[PDB]
């Protein structure tokens, strides 16, 4: 079905990419699902998580603290669905491995598998940015793992251009 995502470059049958600030893109589109680059404690301090949480006026963090108090930490490679607040219907909090914590990059595939539970998502590249993985690798795993329709927002223009120009 037609959707309102605009200005994306089509990489494959199901994967699209744009140089965009995921906060602004979520505010404009109000997608059914926005993906957060979460950690196991849902402590949304920085990176994508800090930015999304700030845009919710800390409501995402308040909700997340209750989630953790009830359920305990997520697994690396795991996820949970919480409110999307003012950004989306739902936020899919997905934990990619953090290379700066020594976590196994193979868990990146498991992390992306969570996307297949949703027909359409707005998402960042998992484990990129402050999580320390190579974004080119993250994009490859995304394309080779996600079968549902995923609209990727890449914050940095230089990285966006490199991701497009190196894509196989």
From Swiss-Prot:
Record's protein name: Papain-like protease nsp3
Coiled-coil region(s): none
Portion of the full-length sequence here: 1025 to 1191 of 7096
Membrane topology: Multi-pass membrane protein
Domain of life, per lineage: Viruses
Catalysed reaction, written as an equation: Thiol-dependent hydrolysis of ester, thioester, amide, peptide and isopeptide bonds formed by the C-terminal Gly of ubiquitin (a 76-residue protein attached to proteins as an intracellular targeting signal)
Subcellular location: Host endoplasmic reticulum membrane
Quaternary structure and interacting proteins, as annotated: May form homohexamers. Interacts with N protein.
Gene that specifies this protein: rep
Stated regulation of activity: Inhibited in vitro by GRL-0617.
Reported function: Responsible for the cleavages located at the N-terminus of the replicase polyprotein. Participates together with nsp4 in the assembly of virally-induced cytoplasmic double-membrane vesicles necessary for viral replication. Antagonizes innate immune induction of type I interferon by blocking the phosphorylation, dimerization and subsequent nuclear translocation of host IRF3. Also prevents host NF-kappa-B signaling. In addition, PL-PRO possesses a deubiquitinating/deISGylating activity and processes both 'Lys-48'- and 'Lys-63'-linked polyubiquitin chains from cellular substrates.
UniProt domain Macro: residue ranges: 2-168
